Design a protein around this ligand. Structure first.
Ligand code: HEM
Lengths: 104, 833
């Protein structure tokens, strides 16, 4: 995916609920720093739904590709209000940006 | 200049201009000295003006252009010429000009203030104008601009504004203008009292001045905007922060307004000038809660943040009076009790803390363990996360909500006084307690807002009002009314007494339309259980009952009704004999697209998985189209027995119905496929457009015939013309481009925007419908605007009440129109004869 295109998508559709940098505050949604390689619902200090905390998968390119296409379908009961991103390419770009931004 | 030279007049030299004025006392003197000559002067300049320029002629190019709109009504009123005041202000032309030159708030203020000035009938009319004006103020100050004249046609028949505008429309000949009559206008739209949109960006916090005179709001626009509660006239434009402003609040006296933001600074501004007065910054994280002491006796400022510390600031100083530590998690909210000595802190960790501001020491800690829920979940009892925390009238009690229950805690005993169970079992995200009737407004989740009567512990009403997630709700300073604000950045004022009442006026957004030739039926999800099929143009409400279906589908030749469910399985009920039904279990996720074959038998369905189900009901035979794609995005029956389907894989396959057989296989995109359309005629051509380009094909070849590369920003949607020869595509911004289907070319970009001169379209497009003529393209989106194919527009008229129209269903007569906006308002439109 194209990191720059993904940055635009993140800013437009995610930033209002999520920060990606280390130490970034939790907002409506949890801070995403360290996302890749971590299990669902493990960011300290954020009140996740039990649905999220119990999904039990590890965040990575593949799990994110599915989750972002339709959040509610992948994690029934999630309190994340987001319809999903239909275009495969757009999800690829966004995930490429997340891979970088949540690890710097 | 001589008057000024004699101290009779003051002069504010505006550069090259000379704006003359009097001081307050200087005016008061003549006010008393002069008598009846003043009314003669009022009446005189009215006639004299008209002898020279008409007040409607009066263009903004004049110097006195706004003068006459700001003062002519004042002159007539002062003159006590209520007949002239009536003639002046009861006019959509007068309103139009005044609102395009001056603005609608002053106007509204006059229609209110003049209620005691006008005659009885006139007041009744002016009240129609008071409601009329609530319609606008959306488009005013922005593009496009409202046509105040035509706006009148949206008023109720009862309304004088309608009767006047409608009769006038009838009087004025051939005005192509084209208007629609909304047949059941009277049954739909539960019009709220007031619509306010204070920010262009996300709104984060808003509140009433203590006086109730003005409303301050702040948000992602990084500024503080304060406007008069009465009129909406903007009072303060203060560029408070360098980063998004998280919350803001009034001081005791409304003399200061403090803002706290992402920049982690606490800034107290003089509400008068907006200059920085006090500034504080000790928190490590972004500040979550800032609140002034309530009483003017002690001057303390409480703040709390994600850094889990509390800071008590002495307003008398530049420094923190005491840092308070002791929460186990982040602090979400904090409030001073009416008793300036007690500070209550609410946090994520499910504890309420009572702090003694006198000693700055923790007094008592309430562990909110009162919600007892023992789940099978191996983890400990349901952890309680407290949300909204509001004070009782007493100040000794805090009404909180958490989990599934509303609790009343006494801060002095640290005991529990009341326990109310709320709607089903979810998590209350936001809430507040009404000072009257022991009502509580609980925004449970996903903009479901339930009004409950606590103590009585009974649900009162389902408060509907926004499609988007409700961000905040707050009460008027009287407590006689309240307003809700959502992600749709729309503030709607509601009368509590009205909210307590039940209503069938508006429908849920989940609706659909079936035109049966001469008649039209509207399918709409019922307020509670299942759904009502309402035959329009008659009362005939046919309620169907069920386990709560998710979607319905009618078979060809009817005689069968099919419906999907969250389970994925579909059940088909025979309509000839309602005891016979078939259902064959399939699909893991909620079923998606559902559609019968050309024949009345066999149902094809798809879902989130990789296969398309061919369900031969009655026999319950399952034939699967093993596409083995990430997910079947959608499909549609083609004219022949071929079946068009696509995934997000950038693929479009063509199968056979009944028996899956992928005859053709197109790989058009590099990503998400959003819909696909056919040439209608036959099926000679079919094309796609999705986050890329628009490729078109003939089916014969496995590869597409031509790629329309026109949009670099990536095309979003497309649709063929009705058989003509055109293919329309929609861009990210809703720019519609018309392409001619002759192998492929560069045809005109018609996207009329601008453009208040006649209405810009709002932007974006949700649906396209070519006129039967093939000459016009009806574009739907914020509202319906008729464009002209290849250059030009057309009917600029008929502004819809809501926005984000979902699917336009045009009657086969092309005489009536049925659609639904984002508010779930049913549009039953008949072309005005
Ligand atoms: C496309 C943009 C977005 C992306 C990529 C995204 C991604 C994520 C991810 C990966 C998680 C799981 C974190 C974890 O398990 O630690 C998450 C959780 C969450 N997100 Fe988002 N998010 C987006 C937009 C939003 C928006 C717009 C909202 C709010 C309206 C939101 C609200 C939430 C919430 C509330 C959670 C926690 C949910 C729960 O506990 O069930 N997200 N998001």
């Amino acid at each position: 995916g194209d990191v720059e295109k993904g940055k635009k998508i993140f800013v437009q559709k995610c930033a209002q609920c999520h920060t990606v940098e280390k130490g970034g505050k939790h907002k409506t949604g949890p801070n995403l720093h360290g996302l890749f390689g971590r299990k669902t619902g493990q960011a300290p200090g954020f009140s996740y739904t039990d649905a999220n905390k119990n999904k039990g998968i590890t965040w990575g390119e593949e799990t994110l590709m599915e989750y972002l296409e339709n959040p509610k379908k992948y994690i029934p009961g999630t309190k994340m209000i987001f319809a999903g991103i239909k275009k495969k390419g757009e999800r690829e770009d966004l995930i490429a940006y997340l891979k970088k931004a949540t690890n710097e | 200049q001589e008057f000024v030279n004699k101290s009779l007049l003051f002069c504010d030299r505006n550069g090259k201009s000379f704006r003359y004025y009097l001081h307050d006392l200087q005016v008061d003197f003549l006010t008393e000295k002069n008598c009846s000559q003043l009314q003669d002067l009022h009446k005189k300049i009215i006639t004299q003006f008209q002898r020279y320029h008409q007040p409607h002629t009066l263009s903004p190019d004049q110097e006195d252009c706004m003068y006459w709109y700001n003062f002519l009504a004042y002159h007539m009123a002062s003159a006590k010429m209520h007949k002239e005041l009536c003639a002046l202000m009861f006019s959509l032309d007068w309103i139009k000009a005044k609102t395009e030159l001056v603005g609608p708030a002053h106007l509204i203020h006059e229609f209110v203030e003049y209620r005691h000035i006008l005659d009885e009938k006139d007041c009744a009319v002016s009240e129609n104008f008071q409601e009329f004006l609530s319609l606008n103020g959306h488009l005013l100050g922005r593009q496009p601009f409202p046509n105040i004249v035509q706006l009148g046609l949206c008023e109720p028949e009862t309304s004088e504004v309608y009767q006047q505008a409608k009769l006038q429309a009838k009087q004025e000949v051939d005005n192509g203008m084209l208007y629609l009559e909304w047949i059941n206008k009277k049954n739909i739209t539960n019009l709220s009292r007031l619509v306010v949109r204070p920010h262009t960006d996300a709104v984060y916090h808003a509140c009433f001045s203590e006086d109730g005179q003005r409303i301050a709001s702040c948000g992602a626009d990084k500024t503080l905007q304060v406007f008069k509660a009465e009129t909406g006239e903007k009072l303060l434009e203060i560029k408070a922060h360098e980063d998004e402003v998280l919350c803001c609040a009034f001081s005791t006296d409304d003399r200061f307004i403090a803002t706290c933001s992402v920049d982690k600074k606490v800034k107290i501004w003089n509400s008068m000038t907006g200059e920085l007065v006090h500034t504080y910054d000790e928190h490590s994280e972004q500040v979550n809660c800032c609140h002034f002491t309530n009483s003017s006796h002690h001057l303390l400022l409480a703040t709390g943040s994600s850094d889990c510390f509390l800071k008590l600031w002495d307003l008398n100083q530049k420094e923190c009076r005491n840092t308070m530590f002791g929460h186990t998690n982040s602090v979400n909210h904090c409030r001073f009790s009416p008793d300036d000595k007690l500070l209550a802190s609410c946090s994520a960790d499910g504890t309420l803390k009572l702090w003694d501001a006198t000693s700055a020491n923790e007094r008592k800690s309430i562990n909110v363990k009162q919600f007892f829920l023992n789940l099978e979940d191996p983890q400990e009892d349901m952890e309680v996360i407290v949300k909204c925390c509001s004070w009782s009238a007493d100040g000794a009690r805090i009404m909180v909500a958490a989990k599934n229950k509303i609790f009343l805690f006494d801060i002095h005993t640290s005991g529990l006084l009341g326990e109310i169970h709320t709607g089903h079992h979810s998590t209350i995200q936001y809430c507040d307690f009404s000072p009257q009737n022991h009502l509580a407004v609980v925004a449970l989740s996903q903009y479901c807002v339930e009004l409950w009567n606590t103590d009585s512990r009974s649900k009162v009403a389902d408060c509907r009002g926004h499609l988007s997630w409700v961000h905040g709700v707050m009460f008027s300073p009287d407590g006689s009314s309240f307003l809700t604000s959502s992600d749709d950045q729309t503030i709607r004022l509601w009368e509590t007494k009205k909210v307590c009442k039940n209503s069938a006026v508006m429908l849920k957004q989940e609706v659909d339309v079936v035109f049966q030739e001469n008649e039209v039926m509207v399918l709409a999800v019922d307020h509670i259980r299942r759904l009502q099929l309402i035959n329009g143009r008659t009362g005939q409400i046919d309620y169907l009952t069920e386990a709560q279906v998710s979607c319905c589908c009618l078979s060809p030749h009817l005689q069968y009704i099919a419906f999907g469910d969250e389970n994925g399985a579909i059940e088909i009920l025979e309509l000839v004999n309602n005891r016979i039904f078939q259902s064959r279990f399939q699909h893991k996720k909620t079923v998606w697209h559902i559609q019968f074959t050309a024949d009345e038998k066999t149902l094809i369905s798809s879902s989130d998985d990789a296969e398309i189900q061919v369900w031969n009901w009655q026999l319950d035979k399952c034939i699967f189209l093993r596409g083995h794609q990430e997910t079947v995005k959608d499909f549609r029956l083609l004219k022949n027995s071929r079946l068009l389907s696509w995934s997000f894989d950038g693929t479009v396959k063509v199968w056979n119905i009944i028996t899956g057989n992928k005859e053709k296989d197109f790989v058009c995109h590099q990503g998400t496929v959003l819909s696909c359309d056919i040439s209608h005629d036959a099926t000679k051509f079919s094309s796609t457009s999705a986050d890329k380009t628009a490729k078109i094909w003939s089916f014969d070849l496995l590869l597409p015939l031509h790629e329309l590369r026109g949009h670099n920003g990536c095309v979003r949607c497309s649709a063929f013309s009705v058989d003509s020869t055109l293919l329309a595509t929609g861009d990210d911004n809703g720019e519609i481009r018309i392409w001619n289907v002759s192998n492929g070319e560069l045809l005109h970009l018609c996207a009329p925007l601008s453009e208040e001169g006649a209405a810009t379209h709002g932007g974006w497009v949700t649906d396209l419908c070519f006129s039967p003529d093939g000459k016009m393209l009806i574009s739907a989106g914020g509202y319906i605007k008729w464009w002209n194919v290849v250059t030009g527009e057309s009917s600029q008229t008929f502004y819809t009440n809501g926005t984000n129209l979902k699917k336009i269903h045009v009657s086969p007569d092309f005489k009536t129109y049925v659609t639904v906006d984002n508010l779930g308002i049913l549009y039953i439109l008949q072309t005005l004869e």
